[PDB]
Design a protein around this ligand. Structure first.
Ligand SMILES: CCc1cncnc1N1CCN(Cc2nc3cc(C(F)(F)F)ccc3[nH]2)CC1
Ligand SMILES: [Zn+2]
Length: 287
């Protein structure tokens, strides 16, 4: 019988309008002493909104349904009168954002490793009919070894809200999401490109002085390909960051297989990648 009393709270990892994420220690059962992450949602906040209530259901369904090395693991889920609890694996490696912030610009080999692992996670989600939408580098964490974990499947984590599409940065989201004109898994391959661009140039591809100007630039999609990148990196970017969603690399029947076949990923051994037998560019434990 998993209860809130089965866990002691250690610290707040995140705080938002709908609740909190804690680092916790399990103090009962065979897992006594194990460290987890605990997401606690406020029911009252959520049930007063039909979309959020659906989104909260979707989150738990997704987590219970996916199982993949590069996607965060759900260990337990329960609820009380006022709270919904999700017990996730604790990831000690931080957000991908922090590595990018420290490094300024990734070397291409570094970027390739992360994008390669992410592509496998995306392919898994798409097989399950799930769209990730937003690969801004805060939405990707690293485990203790330095491997990728997609984490963002639930409610908007902001305290102030703009519907939640526009509540955080929109710089990594596809034009057709911003226009609300209907979309599909192709938006993830767009977002992979935006993240790649961020990794290799220091900033996402389309940024304006304000929110209005940023949206305009994304819709116009006039990509500036820096001349310094390899031909492979440039070609992959040009095929991901396209306004015509159907024509994006990855948007076809092959999905992730299409992207993973690109010359930019030519040195990647996918069997070894998936088994996490490939040495990551950064080791959080050593940092
Ligand atoms: C739960 C997976 C995880 C595993 N291991 C270590 N760190 C992790 N997280 C990943 C998520 N990250 C961001 C975040 N999501 C949030 C959601 C909320 C919400 F309750 F929905 F309002 C509030 C604050 C939030 N902060 C906090 C640390
Ligand atoms: Zn919001």
């Amino acid at each position: 019988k998993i209860r809130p009393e089965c866990f002691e709270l250690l610290r707040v990892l995140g705080k938002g309008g709908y609740g909190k994420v804690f680092q916790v220690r399990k103090v009962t059962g065979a897992n006594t002493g194990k460290i987890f992450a605990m997401k606690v949602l406020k029911k009252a906040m959520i049930v007063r909104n039909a979309k959020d209530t659906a989104h909260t259901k979707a989150e738990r369904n997704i987590l219970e349904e996916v199982k993949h090395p590069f996607i965060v693991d759900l260990i337990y889920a329960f609820q009380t009168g006022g709270k919904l609890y999700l017990i996730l694996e604790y990831l000690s490696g931080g957000e991908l954002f922090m590595q990018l912030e420290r490094e300024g610009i990734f070397m291409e080999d570094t970027a390739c490793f992360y994008l390669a692992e992410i592509s496998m996670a995306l392919g898994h989600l798409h097989q399950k009919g799930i769209i990730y939408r937003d690969l801004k580098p805060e939405n990707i964490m690293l485990n203790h070894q330095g491997h990728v974990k997609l984490t963002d499947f639930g409610l908007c984590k902001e305290s102030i809200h703009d519907t939640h599409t526009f509540c955080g940065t929109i710089e990594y989201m596809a034009p057709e999401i911003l226009m609300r004109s209907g979309h599909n898994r192709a938006v993830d391959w767009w977002s992979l490109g935006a993240l790649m661009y961020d990794m290799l140039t220091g900033a996402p591809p389309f940024t304006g002085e304000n929110r209005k100007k940023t949206i305009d630039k994304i819709l116009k999609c006039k990509l500036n390909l820096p001349p310094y990148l390899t031909q492979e990196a440039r070609d992959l970017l040009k095929k991901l960051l396209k306004r015509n969603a159907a024509s994006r690399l990855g948007a076809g029947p092959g999905d992730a297989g299409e992207v993973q076949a690109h010359p930019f990923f030519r040195h990647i051994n996918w069997e070894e990648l998936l088994a996490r037998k490939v040495e990551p560019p950064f080791k959080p434990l050593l940092q």
